[PDB]
Write an enzyme that holds these catalytic residues in place. Structure first.
Site, PDB file in Angstrom:
ATOM      1  N   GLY A  10       0.770  -1.226   0.000  1.00 33.78           N
ATOM      2  CA  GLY A  10       0.000   0.000   0.000  1.00 33.78           C
ATOM      3  C   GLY A  10       0.805   1.281   0.000  1.00 33.78           C
ATOM      4  O   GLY A  10       0.205   2.362  -0.082  1.00 33.78           O
ATOM      5  N   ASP A  44      19.353   3.535  -1.510  1.00 39.18           N
ATOM      6  CA  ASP A  44      19.575   2.100  -1.373  1.00 39.18           C
ATOM      7  C   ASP A  44      20.853   1.853  -0.582  1.00 39.18           C
ATOM      8  O   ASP A  44      21.936   2.282  -1.004  1.00 39.18           O
ATOM      9  CB  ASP A  44      19.688   1.411  -2.723  1.00 39.18           C
ATOM     10  CG  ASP A  44      19.834  -0.093  -2.570  1.00 39.18           C
ATOM     11  OD1 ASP A  44      18.821  -0.757  -2.264  1.00 39.18           O
ATOM     12  OD2 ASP A  44      20.984  -0.589  -2.687  1.00 39.18           O
ATOM     13  N   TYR A  49      27.781  -2.905   3.013  1.00 42.41           N
ATOM     14  CA  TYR A  49      28.513  -1.848   2.325  1.00 42.41           C
ATOM     15  C   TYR A  49      29.408  -1.048   3.266  1.00 42.41           C
ATOM     16  O   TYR A  49      30.266  -0.295   2.788  1.00 42.41           O
ATOM     17  CB  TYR A  49      27.561  -0.899   1.572  1.00 42.41           C
ATOM     18  CG  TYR A  49      26.672  -1.561   0.539  1.00 42.41           C
ATOM     19  CD1 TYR A  49      26.946  -2.834   0.051  1.00 42.41           C
ATOM     20  CD2 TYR A  49      25.551  -0.900   0.043  1.00 42.41           C
ATOM     21  CE1 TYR A  49      26.093  -3.438  -0.882  1.00 42.41           C
ATOM     22  CE2 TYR A  49      24.711  -1.477  -0.884  1.00 42.41           C
ATOM     23  CZ  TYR A  49      24.981  -2.740  -1.354  1.00 42.41           C
ATOM     24  OH  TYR A  49      24.121  -3.330  -2.252  1.00 42.41           O
ATOM     25  N   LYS A  78      19.300  -3.924   3.712  1.00 40.50           N
ATOM     26  CA  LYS A  78      19.330  -5.339   3.392  1.00 40.50           C
ATOM     27  C   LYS A  78      20.011  -6.103   4.522  1.00 40.50           C
ATOM     28  O   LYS A  78      21.046  -5.675   5.061  1.00 40.50           O
ATOM     29  CB  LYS A  78      20.076  -5.609   2.071  1.00 40.50           C
ATOM     30  CG  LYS A  78      19.741  -4.608   0.973  1.00 40.50           C
ATOM     31  CD  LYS A  78      20.330  -4.974  -0.386  1.00 40.50           C
ATOM     32  CE  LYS A  78      20.232  -3.827  -1.392  1.00 40.50           C
ATOM     33  NZ  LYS A  78      21.261  -2.788  -1.143  1.00 40.50           N
ATOM     34  N   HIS A 111      19.247  -9.864   1.468  1.00 44.59           N
ATOM     35  CA  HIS A 111      20.205  -9.368   0.480  1.00 44.59           C
ATOM     36  C   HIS A 111      20.510 -10.414  -0.587  1.00 44.59           C
ATOM     37  O   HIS A 111      20.574 -10.090  -1.786  1.00 44.59           O
ATOM     38  CB  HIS A 111      21.479  -8.916   1.201  1.00 44.59           C
ATOM     39  CG  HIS A 111      22.338  -7.973   0.423  1.00 44.59           C
ATOM     40  ND1 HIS A 111      23.146  -7.059   1.053  1.00 44.59           N
ATOM     41  CD2 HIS A 111      22.559  -7.835  -0.907  1.00 44.59           C
ATOM     42  CE1 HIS A 111      23.820  -6.388   0.135  1.00 44.59           C
ATOM     43  NE2 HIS A 111      23.471  -6.820  -1.063  1.00 44.59           N
TER      44      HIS A 111
END
Ligand SMILES: NC(=O)c1ccc[n+]([C@@H]2O[C@H](COP(=O)([O-])OP(=O)(O)OC[C@H]3O[C@@H](n4cnc5c(N)ncnc54)[C@H](OP(=O)(O)O)[C@@H]3O)[C@@H](O)[C@H]2O)c1
Ligand SMILES: O=C(O)COc1cc(F)ccc1C(=O)NCc1cccc(C(=O)O)c1
Length: 316
Positions: A10, A44, A49, A78, A111
């Site tokens: 939604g 993102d 990372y 992730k 991920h």
């Protein structure tokens, strides 16, 4: 073209976001600040990372400055492979939230479908160099993700690098409570993903295209590899439209009803990459770009090919 796509939870997701893999920690705060200043509303991220703290500094400053409101941002992270066990998922999410300076994520993804042995190392190895798997399957990891929705930590959950049989396994999970909202996969003119995209879209799952520029800064690049940004055929389409090659590569997935997340730490390119809502590729342009497919992957996971859940043995 409309700036957001409606998810099956939604909520609306901005179709253009900023990628942050490889963005140096000393440059990513400014990159995200610039991105928000020039219009980006979707970032993102990922724990693996190693730069979520610095991404978070930028988000928090722009919220404090009232450049944006939190409800206008769409922040994605992730769950890394070493946190697939049910008892580790919440803490992994909470560490990401703490680092990003947030009290919820808009979207949290598994991920990769492959779980690895927990511990400090992101790629735990045996003495022979193979990644050590976890025995937690994707369905139990999915149930742990569903709990995060029910605790208010995340507004949506999804998956990344799942092949169609793995997506199907989630959709057929006994007692499934929330369908995945997104499958984030590699996609560009050399890896066009027609089969997997149509499957996901037919189930109401939105696809996000990663490495849309072919990841020229990927650490394992070889000179023999094809180069999207240097492909004269793509440059010709860009020239015809008076746009850059990168702008064509970003617009391409948008016109397939995909979300796209180009990465840059260069202020001029961050701004350039957002100026993609003012032109249209023709159907002929789109089919021509699709014709360049060669099943070439930036992220092939060549070190995980023996994991029981390695995603890229199947055709799609
Ligand atoms: N889910 C997953 O498994 C997964 C895997 C891969 C990627 N991703 C996500 O997807 C994002 C994007 O993919 P990616 O980082 O692999 O690569 P990408 O976005 O395809 O390419 C990034 C590279 O392109 C350069 N670049 C950016 N804009 C440019 C422009 N206008 N002109 C010329 N060069 C330009 C960047 O340089 P500068 O930064 O120096 O400007 C950088 O070297 C990642 O950052 C990450 O957020 C997710
Ligand atoms: O994964 C991303 O977002 C971008 O690539 C990375 C980024 C990192 F910070 C560190 C490692 C990678 C990486 O090697 N990915 C590929 C990968 C990872 C895990 C399992 C598989 C598999 O094939 O199962 C494949």
């Amino acid at each position: 073209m409309a700036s957001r796509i409606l998810l099956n939870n939604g909520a609306k997701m901005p179709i253009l976001g900023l990628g942050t893999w490889k963005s140096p920690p000393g440059q990513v705060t400014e990159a995200v600040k610039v991105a928000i200043d020039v219009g980006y509303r979707h970032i993102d991220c990922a724990h693996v990372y190693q730069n979520e703290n610095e991404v978070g500094v930028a988000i928090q400053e722009k919220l404090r400055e009232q450049v944006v409101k939190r409800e206008e941002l769409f922040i994605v992270s992730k769950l890394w492979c070493t946190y697939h066990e049910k008892g580790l998922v919440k803490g992994a999410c909470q560490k990401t939230l703490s680092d990003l300076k947030l009290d919820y994520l808009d979207l949290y993804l598994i991920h990769w479908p492959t779980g690895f042995k927990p511990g400090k190392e992101f790629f735990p190895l045996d003495e022979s160099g193979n990644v050590v798997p976890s025995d937690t399957n994707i369905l139990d990891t999915w149930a742990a993700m569903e709990e995060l929705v029910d605790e208010g930590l995340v507004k949506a959950i999804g998956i990344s690098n799942f092949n169609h049989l793995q997506v199907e396994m989630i959709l057929n999970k006994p007692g499934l409570k929330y369908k995945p909202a997104v499958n984030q996969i590699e996609c560009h003119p050399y890896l066009t993903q027609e089969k997997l995209i149509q499957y996901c879209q037919s189930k109401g799952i939105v696809v996000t295209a990663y490495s849309p520029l072919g990841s020229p800064d990927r650490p394992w690049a070889k000179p023999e590899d094809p180069s999207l940004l240097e492909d004269p055929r793509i440059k010709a389409i860009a020239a015809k439209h008076n746009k850059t090659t990168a702008q064509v590569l970003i617009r391409f997935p948008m016109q397939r009803n995909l979300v796209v997340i180009p990465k840059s730490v260069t202020p001029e390119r961050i701004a350039e990459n957002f100026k993609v809502f003012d032109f249209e590729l023709s159907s002929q342009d789109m089919t021509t770009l699709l014709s360049y497919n060669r099943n070439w992957r930036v992220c092939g996971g060549l070190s995980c090919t023996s994991h029981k859940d390695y995603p890229f043995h199947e055709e799609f």
